[PDB]
Amino acid sequence: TRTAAHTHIKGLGLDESGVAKRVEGGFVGQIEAREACGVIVDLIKAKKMSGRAILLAGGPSTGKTALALAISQELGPKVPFCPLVGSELYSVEVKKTETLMENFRRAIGLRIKETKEVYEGEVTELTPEDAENPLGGYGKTISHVIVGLKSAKGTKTLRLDPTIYESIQREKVSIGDVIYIEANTGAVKRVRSDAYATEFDLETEEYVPLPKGEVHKKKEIVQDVTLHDLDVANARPQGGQDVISMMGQLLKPKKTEITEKLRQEVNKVVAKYIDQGVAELIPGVLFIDEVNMLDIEIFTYLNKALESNIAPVVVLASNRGMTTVRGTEDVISPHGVPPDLIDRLLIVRTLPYDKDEIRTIIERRATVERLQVESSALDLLATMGTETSLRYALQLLAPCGILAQTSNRKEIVVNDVNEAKLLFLDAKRSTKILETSANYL
Amino acid sequence: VTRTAAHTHIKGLGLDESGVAKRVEGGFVGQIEAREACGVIVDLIKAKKMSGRAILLAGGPSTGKTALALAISQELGPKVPFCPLVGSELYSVEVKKTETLMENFRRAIGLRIKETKEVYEEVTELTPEENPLGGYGKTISHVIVGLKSAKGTKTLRLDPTIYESIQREKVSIGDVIYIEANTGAVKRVGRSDAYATEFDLETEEYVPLPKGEVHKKKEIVQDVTLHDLDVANARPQGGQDVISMMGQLLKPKKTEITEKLRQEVNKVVAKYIDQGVAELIPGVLFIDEVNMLDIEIFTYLNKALESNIAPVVVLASNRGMTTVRGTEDVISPHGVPPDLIDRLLIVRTLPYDKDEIRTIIERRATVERLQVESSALDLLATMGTETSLRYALQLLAPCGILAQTSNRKEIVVNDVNEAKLLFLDAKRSTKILETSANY
Amino acid sequence: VNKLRCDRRPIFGKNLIDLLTKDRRVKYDKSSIIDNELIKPLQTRVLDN
Amino acid sequence: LKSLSLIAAHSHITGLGLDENLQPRPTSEGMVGQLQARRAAGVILKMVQNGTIAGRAVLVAGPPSTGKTALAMGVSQSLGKDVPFTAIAGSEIFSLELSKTEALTQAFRKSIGIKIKEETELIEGEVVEIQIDTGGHKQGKLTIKTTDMETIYELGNKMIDGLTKEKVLAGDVISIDKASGKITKLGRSFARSRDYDAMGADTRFVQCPEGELQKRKTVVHTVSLHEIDVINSRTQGFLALFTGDTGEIRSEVRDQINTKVAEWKEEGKAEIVPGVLFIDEVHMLDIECFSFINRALEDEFAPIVMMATNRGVSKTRGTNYKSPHGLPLDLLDRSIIITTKSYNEQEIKTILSIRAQEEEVELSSDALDLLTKTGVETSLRYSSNLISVAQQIAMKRKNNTVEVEDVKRAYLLFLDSARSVKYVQENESQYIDDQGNVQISIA
Amino acid sequence: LKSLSLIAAHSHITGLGLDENLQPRPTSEGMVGQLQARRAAGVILKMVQNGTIAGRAVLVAGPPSTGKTALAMGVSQSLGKDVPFTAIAGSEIFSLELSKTEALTQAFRKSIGIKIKEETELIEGEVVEIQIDRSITGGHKQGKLTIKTTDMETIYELGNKMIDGLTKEKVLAGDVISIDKASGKITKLGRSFAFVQCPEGELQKRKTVVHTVSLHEIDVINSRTQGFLALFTGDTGEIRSEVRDQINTKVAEWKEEGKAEIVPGVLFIDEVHMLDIECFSFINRALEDEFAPIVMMATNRGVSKTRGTNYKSPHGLPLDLLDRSIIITTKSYNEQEIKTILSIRAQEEEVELSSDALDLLTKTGVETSLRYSSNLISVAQQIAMKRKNNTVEVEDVKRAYLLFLDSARSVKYVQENESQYIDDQGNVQISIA
Amino acid sequence: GKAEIVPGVLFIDEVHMLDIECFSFINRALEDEFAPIVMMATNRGVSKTRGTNYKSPHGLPLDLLDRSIIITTKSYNEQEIKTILSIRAQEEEV
Numbered sequence A: 001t002r003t004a005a006h007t008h009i010k011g012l013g014l015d016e017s018g019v020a021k022r023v024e025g026g027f028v029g030q031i032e033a034r035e036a037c038g039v040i041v042d043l044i045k046a047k048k049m050s051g052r053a054i055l056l057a058g059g060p061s062t063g064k065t066a067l068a069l070a071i072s073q074e075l076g077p078k079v080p081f082c083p084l085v086g087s088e089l090y091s092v093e094v095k096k097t098e099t100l101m102e103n104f105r106r107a108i109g110l111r112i113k114e115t116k117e118v119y120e121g122e123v124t125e126l127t128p129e130d131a132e133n134p135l136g137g138y139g140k141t142i143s144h145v146i147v148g149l150k151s152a153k154g155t156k157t158l159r160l161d162p163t164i165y166e167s168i169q170r171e172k173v174s175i176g177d178v179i180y181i182e183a184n185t186g187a188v189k190r191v192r193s194d195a196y197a198t199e200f201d202l203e204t205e206e207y208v209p210l211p212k213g214e215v216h217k218k219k220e221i222v223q224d225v226t227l228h229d230l231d232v233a234n235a236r237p238q239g240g241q242d243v244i245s246m247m248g249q250l251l252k253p254k255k256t257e258i259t260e261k262l263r264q265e266v267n268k269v270v271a272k273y274i275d276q277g278v279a280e281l282i283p284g285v286l287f288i289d290e291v292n293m294l295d296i297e298i299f300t301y302l303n304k305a306l307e308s309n310i311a312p313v314v315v316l317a318s319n320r321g322m323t324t325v326r327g328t329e330d331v332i333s334p335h336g337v338p339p340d341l342i343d344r345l346l347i348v349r350t351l352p353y354d355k356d357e358i359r360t361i362i363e364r365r366a367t368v369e370r371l372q373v374e375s376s377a378l379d380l381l382a383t384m385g386t387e388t389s390l391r392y393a394l395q396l397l398a399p400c401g402i403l404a405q406t407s408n409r410k411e412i413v414v415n416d417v418n419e420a421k422l423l424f425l426d427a428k429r430s431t432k433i434l435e436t437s438a439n440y441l
Numbered sequence B: 001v002t003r004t005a006a007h008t009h010i011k012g013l014g015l016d017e018s019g020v021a022k023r024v025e026g027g028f029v030g031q032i033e034a035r036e037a038c039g040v041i042v043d044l045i046k047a048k049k050m051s052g053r054a055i056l057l058a059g060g061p062s063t064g065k066t067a068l069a070l071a072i073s074q075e076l077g078p079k080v081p082f083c084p085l086v087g088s089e090l091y092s093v094e095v096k097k098t099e100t101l102m103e104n105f106r107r108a109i110g111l112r113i114k115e116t117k118e119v120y121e122e123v124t125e126l127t128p129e130e131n132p133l134g135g136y137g138k139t140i141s142h143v144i145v146g147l148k149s150a151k152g153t154k155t156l157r158l159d160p161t162i163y164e165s166i167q168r169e170k171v172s173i174g175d176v177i178y179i180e181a182n183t184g185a186v187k188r189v190g191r192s193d194a195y196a197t198e199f200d201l202e203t204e205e206y207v208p209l210p211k212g213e214v215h216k217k218k219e220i221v222q223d224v225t226l227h228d229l230d231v232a233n234a235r236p237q238g239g240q241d242v243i244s245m246m247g248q249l250l251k252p253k254k255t256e257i258t259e260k261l262r263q264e265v266n267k268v269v270a271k272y273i274d275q276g277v278a279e280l281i282p283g284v285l286f287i288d289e290v291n292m293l294d295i296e297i298f299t300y301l302n303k304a305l306e307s308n309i310a311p312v313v314v315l316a317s318n319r320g321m322t323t324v325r326g327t328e329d330v331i332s333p334h335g336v337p338p339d340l341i342d343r344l345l346i347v348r349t350l351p352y353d354k355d356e357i358r359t360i361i362e363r364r365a366t367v368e369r370l371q372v373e374s375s376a377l378d379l380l381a382t383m384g385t386e387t388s389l390r391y392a393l394q395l396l397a398p399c400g401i402l403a404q405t406s407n408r409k410e411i412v413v414n415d416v417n418e419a420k421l422l423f424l425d426a427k428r429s430t431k432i433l434e435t436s437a438n439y
Numbered sequence C: 001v002n003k004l005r006c007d008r009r010p011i012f013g014k015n016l017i018d019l020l021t022k023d024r025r026v027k028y029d030k031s032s033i034i035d036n037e038l039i040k041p042l043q044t045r046v047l048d049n
Numbered sequence D: 001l002k003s004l005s006l007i008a009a010h011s012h013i014t015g016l017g018l019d020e021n022l023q024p025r026p027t028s029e030g031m032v033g034q035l036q037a038r039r040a041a042g043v044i045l046k047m048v049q050n051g052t053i054a055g056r057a058v059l060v061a062g063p064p065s066t067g068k069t070a071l072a073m074g075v076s077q078s079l080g081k082d083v084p085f086t087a088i089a090g091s092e093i094f095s096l097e098l099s100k101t102e103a104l105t106q107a108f109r110k111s112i113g114i115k116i117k118e119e120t121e122l123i124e125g126e127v128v129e130i131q132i133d134t135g136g137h138k139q140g141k142l143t144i145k146t147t148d149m150e151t152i153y154e155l156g157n158k159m160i161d162g163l164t165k166e167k168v169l170a171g172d173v174i175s176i177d178k179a180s181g182k183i184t185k186l187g188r189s190f191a192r193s194r195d196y197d198a199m200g201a202d203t204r205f206v207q208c209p210e211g212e213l214q215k216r217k218t219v220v221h222t223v224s225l226h227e228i229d230v231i232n233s234r235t236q237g238f239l240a241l242f243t244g245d246t247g248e249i250r251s252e253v254r255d256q257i258n259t260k261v262a263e264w265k266e267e268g269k270a271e272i273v274p275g276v277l278f279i280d281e282v283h284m285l286d287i288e289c290f291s292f293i294n295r296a297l298e299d300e301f302a303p304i305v306m307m308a309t310n311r312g313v314s315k316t317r318g319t320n321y322k323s324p325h326g327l328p329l330d331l332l333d334r335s336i337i338i339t340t341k342s343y344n345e346q347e348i349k350t351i352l353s354i355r356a357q358e359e360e361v362e363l364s365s366d367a368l369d370l371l372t373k374t375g376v377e378t379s380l381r382y383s384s385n386l387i388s389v390a391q392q393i394a395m396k397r398k399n400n401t402v403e404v405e406d407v408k409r410a411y412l413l414f415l416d417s418a419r420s421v422k423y424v425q426e427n428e429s430q431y432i433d434d435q436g437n438v439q440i441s442i443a
Numbered sequence E: 001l002k003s004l005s006l007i008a009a010h011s012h013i014t015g016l017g018l019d020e021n022l023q024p025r026p027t028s029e030g031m032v033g034q035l036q037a038r039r040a041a042g043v044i045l046k047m048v049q050n051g052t053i054a055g056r057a058v059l060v061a062g063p064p065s066t067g068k069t070a071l072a073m074g075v076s077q078s079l080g081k082d083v084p085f086t087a088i089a090g091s092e093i094f095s096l097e098l099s100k101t102e103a104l105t106q107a108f109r110k111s112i113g114i115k116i117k118e119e120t121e122l123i124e125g126e127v128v129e130i131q132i133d134r135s136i137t138g139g140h141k142q143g144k145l146t147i148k149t150t151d152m153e154t155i156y157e158l159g160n161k162m163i164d165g166l167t168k169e170k171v172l173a174g175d176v177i178s179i180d181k182a183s184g185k186i187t188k189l190g191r192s193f194a195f196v197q198c199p200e201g202e203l204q205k206r207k208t209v210v211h212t213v214s215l216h217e218i219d220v221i222n223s224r225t226q227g228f229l230a231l232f233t234g235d236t237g238e239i240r241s242e243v244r245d246q247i248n249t250k251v252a253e254w255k256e257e258g259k260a261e262i263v264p265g266v267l268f269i270d271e272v273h274m275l276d277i278e279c280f281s282f283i284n285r286a287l288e289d290e291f292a293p294i295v296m297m298a299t300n301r302g303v304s305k306t307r308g309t310n311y312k313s314p315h316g317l318p319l320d321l322l323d324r325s326i327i328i329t330t331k332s333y334n335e336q337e338i339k340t341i342l343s344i345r346a347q348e349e350e351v352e353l354s355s356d357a358l359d360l361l362t363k364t365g366v367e368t369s370l371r372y373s374s375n376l377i378s379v380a381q382q383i384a385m386k387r388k389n390n391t392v393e394v395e396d397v398k399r400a401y402l403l404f405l406d407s408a409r410s411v412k413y414v415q416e417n418e419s420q421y422i423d424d425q426g427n428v429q430i431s432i433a
Numbered sequence F: 001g002k003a004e005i006v007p008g009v010l011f012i013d014e015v016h017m018l019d020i021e022c023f024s025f026i027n028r029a030l031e032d033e034f035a036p037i038v039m040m041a042t043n044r045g046v047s048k049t050r051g052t053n054y055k056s057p058h059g060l061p062l063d064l065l066d067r068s069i070i071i072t073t074k075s076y077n078e079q080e081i082k083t084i085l086s087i088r089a090q091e092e093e094v
């Protein structure tokens, strides 16, 4: 139930065979950009190339963040999407290289799936199956152990090796409370039942209704975890009275420089599990916008890392033109990016919309906000939006509607908008205020 | 066994109810306007009626800004808090300097708390002994413990926790304790003198026998600021296991104080003052060499002066049309930006005069318990008037050394000229360093 | 002693232990059943080495 | 004045509580004028109170001392309580262990509002007096005697050995959880107040609650999610709530907490509360901050920020080019502007009188008019200090009224900025330049 | 065994395809052209496998996108196996737990290695009988495990602590089991069934195992106590030089007597065109060290100011280290070379491009860069896959080219519209009017 | 009457190299009631004042220069060098 200049851009107006139409799927216009991003999405789903990159070129409110959020939505939970700006890379705690390695390992995922048999029910009995002691000594020798169980509508007794007696000894099964044992792995595990819950006025005992389903069942689990999670689990020492783990916990551990030995071992183990079929790797799209501030060292580092084998696609965004590259003034290059990167990367352009498309944008934003304006005022709204800007009209529509609501109205008529534009100003009027007033204003 | 360093010759502004100053009193001579303004400001301060007042004074070196600061600090008495620290101390290492400035504002504001406490104290006799009333092994909850003291003995049993406190103190039957009943724990006076002399030697102190009646009761009044409470709450105070000893053995570092802690301490101090426990007094803040501060502080103070608890601060810049340290074009009088001076007013601290300077030198001779002749005093005062009083001030003591080595108790023209020859000044060095082949 | 009790009773804290336990509970019990070898922590790596 | 607060430069102004008409008044709650500005501020405050739309922005400009900080404080007061206000200045983001970007993120995380509810169960009034008939707990039933029901509770393996846990004399009010919980002491009884003369710090005496025992109690909390972040930062992350060693909170915790709050809101266990951000004099901030906010203020959880500055055509810190207002065009595009105006005589005199009332200061006609002249030729802050100094003079002059005498004494003994600059320019001989150019010599 | 990866740019060439005399084939083992560069790589690899020379700086310069890193990785892979080799980049020199001095020191140390041989013994067979005498809730037990092969019957025994070691996990009476003597470690060769046949041969086999370890690892393991955590966490910095000297003399006398064998490695540095002059002097002092891996460099620019200085020294490198370095310059590609590269990249992508696809790829390589073609191939292939055939005609390539942009086109678009996007003085335009 | 105060004297070197924050620190310390005497010296003359953008005689600005006192030192002739070297030699018993 929240909205911040959003909740109206979903998808890209996509379709099978890659066609983008005029007004559909939230987006309006930018057929070239939307089809290019759809092709990019298909490439990401293919999972063939490593470490590609595409930049953007345009002015304010052209879809850069909108396109990024659209592709992020199109990815879904299957493929992670990591948005970022290079300004967050100013990590005082640890160096830039380690931060980029951590982002890389975060943008690499592995999906694990497995199924374990479960034998459920309630222990109806426990009896020995005696045989005479064959080896040295005589007396008792239990051949095996068979124990009954009953979940809802499913009753079955499990025959099992006699060794499960130790589990019965170890887990203190009592009789008919909780059962967790498998055919091969074996051993019972305990977690009483609500039927006995009223036998005590107050206790600290656990209870549970009767288990449902049949005695034998299976459970399916799917979990997508990044390799960085495994790396940090390996690195961070967790434990108890052992001096290493409790000393680390006392020390408030920081971003220690993990050695590449453990990283490569983790990669080897992950690959050896994945090839066996028990696991499979899925990439993750890292996205960084407003990249003009990124300095020369990061430019060279990304130029080096573009060729990495495990490198996932990283999509970059900016809007600068003929400027001096941030980091140092020696390189005065387009888009605040040295030509070392421009000539080696795919450039995509954007441009603002026409009056019809921008008017549809304003109208749809009004519809999402639930406010509305009649034609006799929306025509002048469109004319002023063309005159001033898109963000100006989009942001100032809400004050007009709220003023009307406080003025006992629901529509937006000529008065409210006239006085609203009379009161507030914009960037050009801001410069005029700067260079007209002579009282420090 | 005394040391006077450019001060201890000042003891007050020397004013009256009618704002009338005294020409020679309290170590201050002259400055009618400055003394009147300082008296008005300190009279406003004593009422505790306001917060966040500020003032800038324009005073050159040796004009008397530090003297005025010390005098005003002594006007409010030792109990009123004060923390005038150097302007270069803001740029710290382990904590961001705005946080340090907040910490100083927290320190400056004062308070007076109190608490009444009782305490019992050697041990006359001892009889130890409740029921488990169930499956428990037993229930020990009362032991009669003796309490000798001097003026009467009153044995008494309390909660068992006092008994385990007795074992914790490891006190024998002939051992004196000091048990504040507010906590039930033990504070150890030591051993006793009655059951003493059991051996010819004892490393443990015999300790004087406690004086007075055992059921001692008293009240304590302490004036403590809030930052001490903050730092006490920040670190643990007790513990028995490894964490406590390792933390105490660990060296704490200066950190950032959270505003939620400010709300908490304000709430608790309000609750305590509403019970009559504590009374309120504001603080006084002073900073010297302020023009070296940067523009970010000079503009953050614009809003920091609006803090409702911030005490009265005094601002002191000596330079003139200077840019704030770190400003490309923000040049202002005394190195303080106009948007900051729009929040306070200006005083003028001016240098001294002929009779004024000679009386200053004579009084410094008095506080240095040395006798000064008229000729030497006039020479010192005159050459101070041309160049600087501080030259004569720093020549007084070596001239006394020369007089003592001459086995005389007065300064003669010979001594002052000998000190002048053996000890130069800035002016003589303004025309002598250029002709130096070796730097 | 009435004053003693009246001052001893209010030892209230800002954030209760219950407010912490509810913030340190488990919603999803577990996942990734085979995980005894995907990590094999360093405390066991020293043993293996 | 619940806390040790003494006085404010603007304490008379507590709340931008515009009337139901929202049409500005010539005078209201002590403020005068700001008509269109107050109307827009009321609109903004209502939009914030809506709690359904995020990612808004408003900019404030104009010369200082026009109540801008007072404007924000009045907005906060009119917003009431349960809405914590982020009190952060411009010079608080260049921290050592907290980079500016995630410092702004932490400020926003504090700025959010949320509510949480929970339910538990207890037993009240358990004046027990166990009596059983060694060890083993044979026939393990305990008498329980509260105000309403006085019976004997049967126990089991966990209680017959749980009553021997928390070894007590069973003559006190105790609490047990009927939902399979542990035993907690709430204090002894008044009969136990007299048995021991000096009760130990642990032992306190509280009456048996006047009612039944099985109490199902609901609790409500208002804790920001960043506090939960600090709590679950480490295995025992409770010491770090106040110390301040957060450590540049990672974004994985941020998105996990976003998912958790979303799912709890869908469950109904949590509901949101609007928040505001305000920092004064945004001009003295890095261009990196403006670039970051221009993207971070359109996120799903994007509380509005109260932008405010007063500089002119200058350069955004972190760049070299001339910029509007010392702010980038991108930040000067996705916002709306609030401006102030030069003071007039009437509001100057009214504000001076209101301040004198707030300071418990009496001002007569002559002093009021003279100080209005001072505050119109100069700014009003000089007269706001002069009323205080003149009341000090008066109460030293054995009177309470302020007139031409105290005002003139202040004028002679306190210097105007323009005349201070003139004195500086005419006495530069005693002053020092950058190169240490000082004329110490006198004669 | 295979390491995870995707279709990488350098996943297209392996080795150099040299000869006995190191003569370069025009196109072999992926590498295309660069005949004298291939000869230099070959002489370098023979020089490093000689093992008689340490500490020789080599630098390579050339225009951007000119296969320098391709040659470098080919050389690195051509180094064979069973020998360590470490590589770093132009921005990993800096560190916080380490100084740049110590970071470069560790980078130099990691390459060289040692290998110590030792004897190993093992028992192997199939547990087909087991009998353990164990009292319940007791503290005294014995056992007899009949670990056997298909050759003889053998009931082995356990000592004091071996019962737990051989009963930590499931041990049955059919299972093929191999245990070691000096440690008693359990290794699951596989269950017999329910699936490996009972083994033949003799139970107890002996062998030899050689363990490898790098110089820095030896320095860090024995210097202190917590350094084992530093093997992974890296919680150490500026190891005391006394331990370094002791391990150096230990290695020297080990090599002298002959217990172990040295396996010298190689250190690799690329994009060193930016680096502090302090690090350059660090290289200048480390090159003549007694133990020194062969060090490579790289550069893209020419006359330029080295970091930490203010003189535009040639090759981005100070003249002192320039003179003491072996320069291998690279020149541009031939059109034959670029079209062969396009063909081998396409077949590495195993994308069945048409002839016209390679024609346009070569035309683009003539007009502009080659990696832009290495992305145009992918986009054209995907657009053709939008037509479902396994061929790319002129239509897909032309559409991809007139929808996407290289450097020059976008540069000219911004040039003719400098007032639209943000310029150096900070003005951008949102409205088309 | 349990302790004994011993107010010693501090020696410092290279004061032209000192920085302005240290200058203000010592400026306030001199005016403080507790400050041991100072032996401070600048080998360089009319050198750049470290920590500031301006150069003044002794590498120190005129404020502290006037606050303190000055003792000039001039170079040697040859005969005292001869005597010093003879003392050095007889100390080295050669």
Ligand SMILES: Nc1ncnc2c1ncn2[C@@H]1O[C@H](COP(=O)(O)OP(=O)(O)O)[C@@H](O)[C@H]1O
Pocket: A004, A005, A006, A009, A026, A027, A028, A030, A058, A059, A060, A061, A062, A063, A064, A065, A066, D298
């Ligand atoms: N091409 C577009 N289609 C739809 N919405 C857009 C488009 N461009 C901008 N917007 C709107 O503007 C917001 C993002 O603006 P953005 O394009 O990122 O500005 P800039 O161009 O300065 O980066 C989104 O919330 C979106 O609703």
Ligand SMILES: Nc1ncnc2c1ncn2[C@@H]1O[C@H](COP(=O)(O)OP(=O)(O)O)[C@@H](O)[C@H]1O
Pocket: B005, B006, B007, B009, B027, B028, B029, B030, B031, B059, B060, B061, B062, B063, B064, B065, B066, B067, B352, B360, F031
């Ligand atoms: N009016 C005065 N009467 C007596 N002594 C004074 C007076 N003004 C200054 N002094 C003395 O001069 C000494 C140096 O003053 P100083 O602190 O340098 O002044 P400022 O702070 O203006 O530079 C002080 O120890 C003080 O005792």
Ligand SMILES: Nc1ncnc2c1ncn2[C@@H]1O[C@H](COP(=O)(O)OP(=O)(O)O)[C@@H](O)[C@H]1O
Pocket: B302, B303, D008, D009, D010, D011, D013, D030, D031, D032, D033, D063, D064, D065, D066, D067, D068, D069, D070, D071, D351, D354, D355, D380
């Ligand atoms: N409308 C008003 N009514 C009453 N007092 C006012 C009004 N406007 C301004 N003031 C007074 O002027 C001062 C304005 O200061 P302020 O503008 O908050 O400082 P800054 O410009 O640094 O934010 C306040 O202390 C307040 O007492």
Ligand SMILES: Nc1ncnc2c1ncn2[C@@H]1O[C@H](COP(=O)(O)OP(=O)(O)O)[C@@H](O)[C@H]1O
Pocket: A307, E009, E010, E013, E030, E031, E032, E033, E034, E063, E064, E065, E066, E067, E068, E069, E070, E071, E300, E341, E370
């Ligand atoms: N002769 C070649 N053989 C194989 N691959 C080449 C050749 N020339 C260029 N490439 C490819 O083009 C890219 C250019 O990189 P490279 O020439 O190694 O370094 P640089 O880009 O610094 O010149 C390489 O990634 C490589 O895959």
Ligand SMILES: [Mg+2]
Pocket: A064, A065, A066, A068, A289, D295
């Ligand atoms: Mg974006």
Ligand SMILES: [Mg+2]
Pocket: B302, B303, D064, D065, D068, D069, D280
């Ligand atoms: Mg303000």
Ligand SMILES: [Mg+2]
Pocket: E066, E067, E068, E069, E070
């Ligand atoms: Mg390369």
Ligand SMILES: [Mg+2]
Pocket: B288, F027, F028, F031
């Ligand atoms: Mg001073």
